């Protein structure tokens, strides 16, 4: 169009760069937890079993009865003044990383769409494998990698409530002291309207 | 088995020359360009 | 280097003999609904079975430059879905990855 | 001790060699739910009203319930093949980063 | 205000010409040495 | 059968250098291929064997 668009070979580069100064926390206490509870669904959502979905998912009322008794005796914890940073760093990291692979997805169609006008131009029977392309109305660029990572990354943000639900949670995240103490101007604005810009993205 | 340890010299050096985002950081005017892109792509993203 | 490129030329070749099976096997597809649909039938019968003749064409066509996976099959109308997905594989990531393998080592020899 | 031993440097370095060739995604439909999850827990552990604490547990524990009565009829829901492999480099790449 | 896209150059050209990884990546024998050094601390960390 | 027949069809279509080229896979086709093999059968076979025995023999004595 006479406009210049980044690849995922720039995007990495200045990802490199962008490390080079001081970045954010990744051998954290947080962190540690997320792999603790990320491990802990990915098995409760992966077992076969009916009854161990069953035994695993009481306890979790247990446990989560239990807190709330002492929570109404008002045995709230509120985390640290340090804690609270780390935390904040860390969800920051983690969002950020959701937008990380957007310009690699683009190239997959690029090559797609390479390689499937080679397949048009290089076979010698033009007439068979196009009419069975032109008739249909798929998306005749199905890059099943990176590119139904995307579609299914597509799904998850198009529903609503939970997307709105964020929003509101990080403004009230960033509206907290201590974010102005963990994060910065820059990411701090990036954060509050990340959502804004994944679904613009 | 140092296949392992053979042939990853030769992908190193295959991304050195090959890869556009090591050619980019190994080529001399590299701040200027990175710069420039990234100033460029920060704001818009179409 | 050679090496590497006859594999991309095999994987080349066995792409666009599969191709035509899908094609063919679609056109099947659509008459058999057809008939389907309808249960004169002679004539949809003699289609299916000039159809069925091409498929199994295409599916030798396709076993002939074959180097394994479609070596279990076999050239019968049952046989369709694992030679389609084969296609897919193919188009997805065996032509790219080859084809990208092949593009790097050209020009480590040569640069 | 004459040895020699890596620099943050050299890590980055290494690091971005490494990410150079095919490297997993984060922009995947998982990492999605699990910034979902994160950022639910910690804004359930980092109110100070006892009270929203309360109304959020007793929620969580509603939700797990109507799951676990769904379970018992058989309703257990596997994930996926491309799903779960998905969820499986996911989670390898978040672990990974611990040790960075 | 362009203090940040002319102090982030600066920034930039800094690291380049002194940030270990960059330079190591900019030198015209990086694959070498960066292959090396990662077989070795693979195996051992200490 | 007709299946079948095709199919053998085409494996005689991988190893002919010409013979049958111009003839298709279908049973119009069948009398085509039919007379090549007889030939394969008549004179082909023994006399190009006769004559590579005759060349064994003047060479390689």
Same mark, same amino acid.
């Given at each position: 169009?006479?406009?210049?668009?980044?690849?995922?070979?720039?995007?990495?580069?200045?990802?490199?760069?962008?490390?080079?100064?001081?970045?954010?926390?990744?051998?954290?206490?947080?962190?540690?937890?997320?792999?603790?509870?990320?491990?802990?669904?990915?098995?409760?959502?992966?077992?076969?079993?009916?009854?161990?979905?069953?035994?695993?998912?009481?306890?979790?009322?247990?446990?989560?009865?239990?807190?709330?008794?002492?929570?109404?005796?008002?045995?709230?914890?509120?985390?640290?003044?340090?804690?609270?940073?780390?935390?904040?760093?860390?969800?920051?990291?983690?969002?950020?990383?959701?937008?990380?692979?957007?310009?690699?997805?683009?190239?997959?169609?690029?090559?797609?769409?390479?390689?499937?006008?080679?397949?048009?131009?290089?076979?010698?029977?033009?007439?068979?494998?196009?009419?069975?392309?032109?008739?249909?109305?798929?998306?005749?660029?199905?890059?099943?990698?990176?590119?139904?990572?995307?579609?299914?990354?597509?799904?998850?943000?198009?529903?609503?409530?939970?997307?709105?639900?964020?929003?509101?949670?990080?403004?009230?995240?960033?509206?907290?002291?201590?974010?102005?103490?963990?994060?910065?101007?820059?990411?701090?604005?990036?954060?509050?309207?990340?959502?804004?810009?994944?679904?613009?993205? | 088995?140092?296949?392992? @340890? +053979?042939?990853?010299?030769?992908?190193?050096?295959?991304? /050195?020359?090959?890869?556009?985002?090591?050619?980019?950081?190994? @080529? +001399?005017?590299?701040?200027?360009?990175?710069?420039?892109? /990234?100033?460029?792509?920060?704001?818009?993203?179409? | 280097?050679?090496?590497?490129?006859?594999?991309?030329?095999?994987?080349?070749?066995?792409?666009?003999?599969?191709?035509?099976?899908?094609?063919?096997?679609?056109?099947?597809?659509?008459?058999?609904?057809?008939?389907?649909?309808?249960?004169?039938?002679?004539?949809?019968?003699?289609?299916?079975?000039?159809?069925?003749?091409?498929?199994?064409?295409?599916?030798?066509?396709?076993?002939?430059?074959?180097?394994?996976?479609?070596?279990?099959?076999?050239?019968?109308?049952?046989?369709?879905?694992?030679?389609?997905?084969?296609?897919?594989?193919?188009?997805?990531?065996?032509?790219?990855?080859?084809?990208?393998?092949?593009?790097?080592?050209?020009?480590?020899?040569?640069?």
């Amino acid at each position: 169009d006479g406009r210049i668009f980044a690849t995922d070979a720039l995007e990495v580069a200045i990802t490199f760069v962008e490390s080079l100064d001081n970045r954010f926390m990744t051998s954290t206490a947080s962190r540690l937890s997320t792999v603790q509870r990320e491990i802990e669904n990915l098995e409760t959502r992966l077992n076969p079993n009916p009854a161990n979905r069953v035994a695993t998912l009481r306890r979790r009322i247990s446990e989560l009865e239990r807190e709330l008794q002492e929570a109404e005796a008002g045995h709230i914890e509120v985390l640290e003044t340090h804690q609270a940073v780390e935390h904040i760093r860390d969800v920051y990291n983690l969002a950020s990383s959701l937008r990380a692979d957007f310009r690699r997805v683009e190239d997959s169609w690029r090559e797609a769409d390479r390689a499937l006008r080679q397949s048009i131009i290089g076979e010698q029977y033009h007439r068979g494998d196009i009419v069975e392309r032109l008739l249909n109305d798929q998306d005749a660029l199905l890059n099943t990698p990176e590119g139904r990572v995307f579609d299914s990354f597509q799904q998850q943000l198009r529903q609503s409530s939970e997307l709105k639900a964020m929003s509101e949670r990080l403004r009230v995240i960033l509206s907290h002291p201590s974010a102005s103490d963990a994060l910065n101007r820059l990411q701090r604005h990036d954060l509050r309207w990340l959502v804004k810009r994944l679904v613009d993205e | 088995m140092e296949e392992n @340890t +053979r042939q990853r010299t030769e992908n190193y050096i295959s991304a /050195k020359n090959q890869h556009p985002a090591w050619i980019l950081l190994a @080529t +001399r005017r590299a701040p200027l360009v990175l710069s420039c892109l /990234k100033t460029l792509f920060e704001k818009s993203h179409d | 280097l050679t090496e590497i490129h006859q594999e991309l030329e095999t994987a080349r070749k066995q792409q666009q003999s599969l191709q035509p099976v899908a094609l063919s096997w679609e056109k099947y597809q659509k008459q058999e609904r057809q008939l389907a649909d309808w249960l004169e039938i002679e004539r949809v019968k003699a289609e299916l079975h000039r159809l069925n003749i091409e498929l199994t064409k295409r599916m030798s066509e396709a076993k002939r430059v074959d180097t394994g996976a479609l070596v279990e099959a076999g050239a019968d109308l049952d046989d369709i879905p694992v030679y389609l997905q084969r296609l897919q594989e193919l188009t997805e990531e065996a032509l790219p990855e080859k084809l990208n393998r092949f593009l790097d080592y050209l020009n480590r020899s040569s640069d």
